[PDB]
Write a protein that binds this ligand. Structure first.
Ligand code: FMN
Length: 305
């Protein structure tokens, strides 16, 4: 069973991906990369690309037109060995553009895009998608991917229209004869969720997304649980050290100012269920100096114990 960190725009940058690998994740993905922005040499897209030496990390691209996706894939293939296509995002901005989950609105057009991308991805080509645009059409979507030579598939078990409402219907993948590595995603917050999702879907592995924000040890817990039926929670000292390591990685990769801004997104997760976390978060949300943030987090933990 393989357990990977899902792509999460705004969260899964190189620092968080690295931290996840330091807790046992098997693989990860870049934040979604606009194919058009990449071809335009935009600064924003250039900053999202993984380094070519960064192992086991896909470059996920998004777009609505076959020519931009294929061209971006051909160019990226010169340096990256694994390209993934986002065909699941329900975000309004992305769907309005006809990208992400909007690619599932017309499966004839989806097949066209997948066939053209297959020709342009020299290495491993995967697709991350959903069950369908507005209804479960996963057998057809999966058949397209297998027939067009996709190497691996990641499926968030919700339709695009549901966004994050309703539940991840893990059993929807049980009907699929898994001819290629197939991974389940959706509502995976604990090891118990991970085990049930694997059992109901019949998949080869799973992705952790919201469940890993501020909780990178979830990868080790999931593997511990699947192997032995038991897992443990991190000590307060281990939470502190993880926060410190994450912050150090953020400073190294993005500089002090940006490190503080990015870390703000993970504080709720790191302090989850810690006495007085709400008060602490309120006090640190506007702190701009990285040294002050680090000292307050240290003070908050050592006092909790
Ligand atoms: C903040 C955020 C950003 C996301 N960005 C991406 C993305 O860039 N690419 C992608 O394929 N999915 C993206 N996802 C979807 C996740 O990869 C995942 O499939 C989804 O959250 C369902 O898993 P979960 O319910 O276990 O969190 C995003 C999810 C979140 C919460």
């Amino acid at each position: 069973v393989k357990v990977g960190l899902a792509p999460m725009a705004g969260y899964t940058d190189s620092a968080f991906r690295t931290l996840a690998f330091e807790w046992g994740a098997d693989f990860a993905f870049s934040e979604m990369v606009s194919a058009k922005g990449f071809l335009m040499n935009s600064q924003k897209t250039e900053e999202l690309l993984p380094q070519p030496h960064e192992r086991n990390v896909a470059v996920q691209i998004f777009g609505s037109e076959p020519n931009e996706l294929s061209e971006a894939a051909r160019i990226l293939s010169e340096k990256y060995k694994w390209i993934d296509l986002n065909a699941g995002c329900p975000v309004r901005k992305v769907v309005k553009e006809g990208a992400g989950g909007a690619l599932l609105k017309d499966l004839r057009h989806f097949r066209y895009i997948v066939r053209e991308l297959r020709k342009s991805v020299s290495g491993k080509f995967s697709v991350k998608t959903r069950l369908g645009w507005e209804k479960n059409e996963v057998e057809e979507i999966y058949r397209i991917l297998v027939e067009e030579g996709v190497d691996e598939v990641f499926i968030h078990t919700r339709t695009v229209v549901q966004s994050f409402t309703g539940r991840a219907e893990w059993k929807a993948l049980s009907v699929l004869e898994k001819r290629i590595p197939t991974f389940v995603s959706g509502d995976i917050f604990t090891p118990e969720d991970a085990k049930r999702a694997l059992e109901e879907s019949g998949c080869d592995g799973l992705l952790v997304a919201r469940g890993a924000i501020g909780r990178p040890w979830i990868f080790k817990q999931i593997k511990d649980f699947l192997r032995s039926g038991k897992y443990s929670e991190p000590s307060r000292e281990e939470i502190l050290r993880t926060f410190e390591r994450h912050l150090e990685l953020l400073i190294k990769t993005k500089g002090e100012r940006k490190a503080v801004v990015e870390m703000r997104k993970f504080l709720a997760g790191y302090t989850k269920d810690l006495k007085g976390a709400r008060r602490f978060r309120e006090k640190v949300m506007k702190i701009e100096e990285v040294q002050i943030l680090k000292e307050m987090f240290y003070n908050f933990i050592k006092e909790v114990e």
